[PDB]
Design a protein around this ligand. Structure first.
Ligand SMILES: Nc1ncnc2c1ncn2[C@@H]1O[C@H](COP(=O)(O)OP(=O)(O)O)[C@@H](O)[C@H]1O
Ligand SMILES: [Mg+2]
Ligand SMILES: [Mg+2]
Length: 215
């Protein structure tokens, strides 16, 4: 059995028996499975654009697309954009849960951060992308493109996205990047859109835009 190098979270996640698959154990209930199927039926375009592919289920294990699979040197950041169980967000509208090399920067997921500390941790995450300003700018711009479309699409989705994370990935050489929504374990049906989750995404767009333009 090969344990998957999770950047954050608590769930048991292992490499699949075949290439490009991770198996995530549904720890507490099968709600995550119920929610993937609900989104498949009602919001299929959202699922295709923004969520790792669900390949199927093996007992309590979801077979998911490995978002790190096609990367030589992946850098991963987990940002919780849905409501936390009980606590307020560590950066006001969202909580950075972890990132590649965060230990080197004395990152603490329990620490409440100022705007300046929040921006500095995102800058820390980008340092592995090296000194080629142009390439790292293109990574930020590609993230902004997808997050802006996500924020727009969220207005017409009647789900409370409790506990969901954005998984940001870029390669050391900045040749490839993506961002996707994961962790649907606490997601619930509601009669309106989720303004709290939209506010998390628009706040990230503002921060990344500032980084992409700052000389
Ligand atoms: N499809 C995926 N591809 C790659 N890494 C993933 C994927 N889903 C989750 N991860 C990794 O696992 C961590 C936890 O995922 P998440 O679904 O939030 O589970 P948990 O219940 O442990 O919070 C993420 O921070 C990320 O590092
Ligand atoms: Mg999670
Ligand atoms: Mg995809």
């Amino acid at each position: 059995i090969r344990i998957f190098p999770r950047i954050a979270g608590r769930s048991y996640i292992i490499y699949g028996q075949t290439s490009g698959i991770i198996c995530k154990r549904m720890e507490k209930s099968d709600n995550e499975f119920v929610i993937y199927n609900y989104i498949s039926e009602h919001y299929d375009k959202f699922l295709k654009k923004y969520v790792p592919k669900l390949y199927g289920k093996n007992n309590d294990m979801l077979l998911l697309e490995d978002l790190t699979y096609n990367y030589n040197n992946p850098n991963v950041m987990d940002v919780k954009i849905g409501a936390r169980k009980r606590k307020s967000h560590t950066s006001g509208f969202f909580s950075i849960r972890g990132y590649t090399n965060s230990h080197d920067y004395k990152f603490d997921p329990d620490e409440y951060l100022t705007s300046e500390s929040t921006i500095n941790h995102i800058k820390n995450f980008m340092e592995a992308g090296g000194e080629n300003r142009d390439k790292t700018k293109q990574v930020l711009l590609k993230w902004i493109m997808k997050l802006s479309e996500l924020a727009n699409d969220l207005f017409e989705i009647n789900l409370k996205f409790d506990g969901v994370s954005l998984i940001f990935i870029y390669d050391d050489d900045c040749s490839k990047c993506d961002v996707n929504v994961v962790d649907f374990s606490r997601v619930k049906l509601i009669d309106t859109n989720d303004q709290m989750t939209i506010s998390a995404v628009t706040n990230l767009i503002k921060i990344l835009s500032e980084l992409a333009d700052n000389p």
